[PDB]
Amino acid sequence: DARFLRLMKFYLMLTGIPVIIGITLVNIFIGEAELAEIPEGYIPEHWEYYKHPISRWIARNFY
Amino acid sequence: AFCAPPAYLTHQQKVLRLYKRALRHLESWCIHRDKYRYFACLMRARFEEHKNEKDMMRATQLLREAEEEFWQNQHPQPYIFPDSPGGTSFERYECYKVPEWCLDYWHPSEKAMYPDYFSKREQWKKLRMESWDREVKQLQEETSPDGIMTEALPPARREGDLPPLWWHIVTRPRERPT
Amino acid sequence: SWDKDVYPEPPSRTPAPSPQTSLPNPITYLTKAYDLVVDWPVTLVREFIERQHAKNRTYYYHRQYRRVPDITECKEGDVLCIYEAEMQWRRDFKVDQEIMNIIQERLKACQQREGENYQQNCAKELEQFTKVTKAYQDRYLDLGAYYSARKCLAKQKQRMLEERKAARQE
Amino acid sequence: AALQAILYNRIGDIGFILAMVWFSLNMNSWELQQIMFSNNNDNLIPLMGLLIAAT
Amino acid sequence: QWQEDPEPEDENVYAKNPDFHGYDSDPVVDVWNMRAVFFFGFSIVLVFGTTFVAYVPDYRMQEWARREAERLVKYREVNGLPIMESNYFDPSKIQLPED
Amino acid sequence: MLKIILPSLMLLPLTWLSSPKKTWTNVTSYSFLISLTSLTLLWQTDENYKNFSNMFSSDPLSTPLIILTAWLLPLMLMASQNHLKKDNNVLQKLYISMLISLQILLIMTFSATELIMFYILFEATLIPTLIIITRWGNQTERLNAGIYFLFYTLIGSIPLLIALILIQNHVGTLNLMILSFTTHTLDASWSNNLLWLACMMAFLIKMPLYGVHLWLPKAHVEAPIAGSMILAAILLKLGSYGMIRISIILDPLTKYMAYPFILLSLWGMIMTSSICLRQTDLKSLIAYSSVSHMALVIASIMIQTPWSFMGATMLMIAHGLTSSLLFCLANSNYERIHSRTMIMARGLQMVFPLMATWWLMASLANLALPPSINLMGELFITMSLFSWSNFTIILMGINIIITGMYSMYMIITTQRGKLTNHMINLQPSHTRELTLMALHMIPLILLTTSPKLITGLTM
Amino acid sequence: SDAPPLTLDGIKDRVLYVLKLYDKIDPEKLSVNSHFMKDLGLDSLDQVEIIMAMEDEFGFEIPDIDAEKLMCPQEIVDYIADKKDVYE
Amino acid sequence: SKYKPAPLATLPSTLDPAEYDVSPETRRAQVERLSIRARLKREYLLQYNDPKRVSHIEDPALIRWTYARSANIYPNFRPTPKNSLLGAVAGFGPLIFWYYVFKTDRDRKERLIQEGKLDRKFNISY
Amino acid sequence: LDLIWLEKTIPKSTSTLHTNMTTLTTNQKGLIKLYFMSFLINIILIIILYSINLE
Amino acid sequence: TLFQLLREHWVHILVPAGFVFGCYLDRKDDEKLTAFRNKSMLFQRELRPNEEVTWK
Amino acid sequence: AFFKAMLFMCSGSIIHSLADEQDIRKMGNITKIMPFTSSCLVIGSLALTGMPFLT
């Protein structure tokens, strides 16, 4: 039982901690977009309708 | 708990069991020790007045009427010792009574923390393995011819023999295991 | 922040205070200690974060949908026209749900704010919740799990025909 | 004794759920502030549910 | 009787390999099956799949709808229009039967 | 969907071209990666559902069912390894291919845009399912279980085929989107009432509806563990998913046509939950528990309300994970003492403390402890039924009481009391077994954190 | 908790102690091996009370099937020692 | 006085007339019963204490009980007037009763809605 | 219900009917004389249906 | 690299190649369905300066 | 919540010292042999019974 719990925690932290650091670092140094009125004559891209840098990055590169 | 019951209770056994119950329920009614001692002696006098009844058929009838009297004068909530059936601590430690065969699954890193305990345990296992065949033979030899059988087990008759079917008695968990 | 027009809040009216006793108020001193030990370091961390945000300023836009023809202007069996009209109706239905949520949020905030006065001072929020609920029920009640623009229209026409009948008898 | 506590409190939980379903259908809320505007209604069905849950 | 094997005996999996993880009798195959399950199942799918789902923006246009609702509530109130009307469709667009 | 289906098809050559010592590690790992890719279907930033082509789509109803299907394949593989370890290499690969085949068929089934395509894939699943039950089931009753399962389905499916042909001859298409937009009211003729039943019976037998449920307790008790997992988790949901898709064209006859099936379900859920109190076989107990839960799904789909559809969608997913977990937990004791009799092994918390924790959470999920998605689905179903008729709460209330009774009864009987200490073959829990339990229970908790993902079509 | 563990000599002392306070026994002729019926001349009703006094002394019950066989103080000492896992 | 037994509060052995019977016919039965118990106990213990046992002890009585309560049921079922009447009443009885509860209630609810005397005040979710 | 009457009325009566129909139609003597008699009945029946349905 | 190594690890290209091929077939499905690109009521607009298609 | 928790604590103090004995018929004289537990037991009982100015 203790071996299993050690292994499960190790493998959740193996990628889980780096993702938590990366999210924290993105949220401190990048931050979310602020809402702005569409300039006249401007056609925004689809990923400019989202706030979060991660969500815009996934939207831009994969959708 | 250690001795198996017989096929039937003799008349004497039934009378002595009623005597123990009657006193114990009296103790529950009286509470105070001086009051209980007074009525405990009065209770014994009632069992004595018919001690030498030689009729049997009257003795059996006297047992009937006493048992009927007991049920009517029974304490609804008699005192029970804490570890007895129905007591508050009854089976309280069963969740801690881990059988010895669990140790056969311990990891070597677990066993390495008790090097001396697991050396003695090997001696007890070697002793158990050597004695089994003799134990089985003794029970086969001592079977009675007529089918009448009981749960009583024989002792070890010879020298170096262990009593048959001893492992589950000798190695059982302690009453207070942890 | 937020729009004070969408989510109105009455102005605060906090008394003096005018303490009578000579004992010291422990809440006053605990708040000063709190404002130093807790509030002040937290503000510095936030101000650092906001400074980083302004160096990477990006923007996002609220999407605008141009109106398309309603289900009323679609020929039956015209799936291309029905699809766009139906998708428009689902967008509006969703926005109606959030308008209900805003009105209930105002109602709940006002009740809490008014306390023992809520039975008198929540009259306008309770009336708006009553009106906006009537209008919601007329659009959407009893449409079912397969609600749609076609069913909403059939529900409206059934109500209009009954209103017309009652008025004609008058 | 452990299962007995579960059983009796599950019989009470039926009344709690009765109140919950009633308030979400008649007030569209489980929030106490919005439930306060049920003051003028007839609240026998939901209050009987709370009473059973409390019992 | 017919010619049939006896039933096999109960086996303790930990007797030969006390580090058995449940996957294979070969110890090296066993530990790598354990690692692949923990790595791909937990490190990859459960962590990154959870992250990816968390950052799906405006899921089913719920953020846009609240943003659009506030815009309309604002507009409909400064201009004095009702917040929400009973009729979804303008009655002028409907032609009822004469009867 | 092709970027999900094609890699799934490549698992078949991967199985057959792998070395004997690498097959399980290979197929399990890529099966996990295919589950990861199916999450792309959750990237839904608008209210227009994804139509990838004329053939495959995905909306908020099929997307959760597709992802749950993709997740089950790795879990079923881990569940199967220990009891297959005596089969030769070709037999192991054949078993894996059957499991992959269901995964492929089911993903295609939930993404099909056309009803006869749904029907063909819906019927195709019987082949690998029957093979799994009868070739790898343990008892002689597995053959009878195969017959009941196959022919309860088939007798209902033939009327469904007739109805689908009839609709297509009349409308000109069985495409679901076009059927939705162009639907027109039905007349309440005897002929249309038979049409309603032909469209509904196969889905109702599959749920199963109370009265025609006898195939399911038989199929579970006799199937191997991976068969029980897929059957309880996904295959029963084909009926509920079928009913939701096809009921759009059946209005307004469902208003009166549903009454006998609401009655069977609401009363039947009490009969089957009460059976669980006196069931000696643990697998049978879990199976009857499913019939009771799926009775709620039937009732809420029949009344066709926004709440009822949302509560049914959540319960479908929650039951899928919970029941699959319970079968896996029961199978771990069976693999040690080779009996399904519940009262045989006892006090197991003494020797399997962490497995007992998995038991408790599975049981707490099953009796719908808040805020689990199990409770959320059952709660919104209860609210919608109360609206349909306030007297439904009486039958709901009885089922809630009984469900707590048997859920805790199973835990007390098997995990608590004195240890049955003659069972010296109670080997410690496998890492694989404890991992398998966690892979069920973490998603249940994660879905409880973000319940928007399984609300379905109506919310 | 706070009670000391029982001992073979500790049990023996308290078993003989209880018997020395029984007026139907002369303390001087009492030894661990004194048979209650033969050597001490007590009837069966008396033996019921001796066991009942033993249960009170140590605060635990002796089932009737086992109590009826305890006919000398050493049998009582042995029984209490095996019940409570006393071994030295 | 006197104790009256009930199915859920049974007669004590001490009050049972059959516990005080000493006829040799009864004592022979009691001895015969103990011989069966003792032989079964011996067989169990020989398995239990055997140091070469590797698995749990099979329990034929439990297998018979679980078999009797499942597979053995249908072969030993005979349709009788009591079975048939009970099956029809239990199977269909509750279904018909609950049909009229829900049908009657829902008919009234619709009747009030058509003619406007159902108070749907804030009900917007269903 | 579950072990008796739901078994008896749905799966078990279906099994009995088709077994009964199977034994009544497959218990053939293998005598060409009897089959040719039955083919004569088929011919007569087809001629009768044609005659009555003659406009 | 080594026939013993390659004969064991070459199978690791099957599922990735199924994914890449599955993605390729999904883009071919987009190409067959461009009959309303930049022609719907909801979204049609004028093309930006150096823009050939609104989506691909 | 105050005097009832104390009453249970004081009885748990007694139960623990008398070797897990919960029956009051095997207690007695606790006022002298357990002075602290007895004093708190009496305080708790007087608060329960409404002794003036206690909780």
Ligand SMILES: CCCCCCCCCCCCO[C@@H]1O[C@H](CO)[C@@H](O[C@H]2O[C@H](CO)[C@@H](O)[C@H](O)[C@H]2O)[C@H](O)[C@H]1O
């Ligand atoms: C599921 C797993 C997902 C893994 C997620 C990994 C996401 C990685 C996040 C990268 C985010 C940063 O992304 C980057 O941000 C910058 C901000 O300078 C933005 O860049 C854009 O705006 C900035 C604003 O200053 C301009 O200077 C720049 O020229 C322009 O391109 C883009 O958004 C992107 O170029």
Ligand SMILES: CCCCCCCCCCCCO[C@@H]1O[C@H](CO)[C@@H](O[C@H]2O[C@H](CO)[C@@H](O)[C@H](O)[C@H]2O)[C@H](O)[C@H]1O
């Ligand atoms: C909730 C679901 C409800 C389940 C059904 C409840 C109703 C049950 C009552 C059905 C009544 C009919 O009961 C009927 O009884 C007769 C009495 O011999 C049985 O008859 C039985 O013996 C006869 C000989 O006489 C055989 O030919 C027959 O095949 C055999 O079954 C029928 O097989 C059974 O169908």
Ligand SMILES: CCCCCCCCCCCCO[C@@H]1O[C@H](CO)[C@@H](O[C@H]2O[C@H](CO)[C@@H](O)[C@H](O)[C@H]2O)[C@H](O)[C@H]1O
């Ligand atoms: C309306 C929707 C629902 C309709 C569904 C109808 C389902 C019909 C399923 C038919 C089942 C065929 O089942 C076939 O016959 C019976 C079923 O009792 C089984 O028979 C089994 O039980 C009988 C006793 O009843 C035993 O004597 C026999 O040895 C045993 O095999 C066969 O082993 C099985 O091959």
Ligand SMILES: CCCCCCCCCCCCO[C@@H]1O[C@H](CO)[C@@H](O[C@H]2O[C@H](CO)[C@@H](O)[C@H](O)[C@H]2O)[C@H](O)[C@H]1O
């Ligand atoms: C429109 C068709 C819908 C129904 C679908 C078809 C379902 C099948 C029903 C007919 C076949 C089942 O047939 C039913 O089960 C088996 C045969 O399998 C027979 O049962 C028999 O099985 C075997 C083989 O003979 C014997 O060892 C057994 O003792 C005997 O009971 C049943 O007496 C019969 O009633």
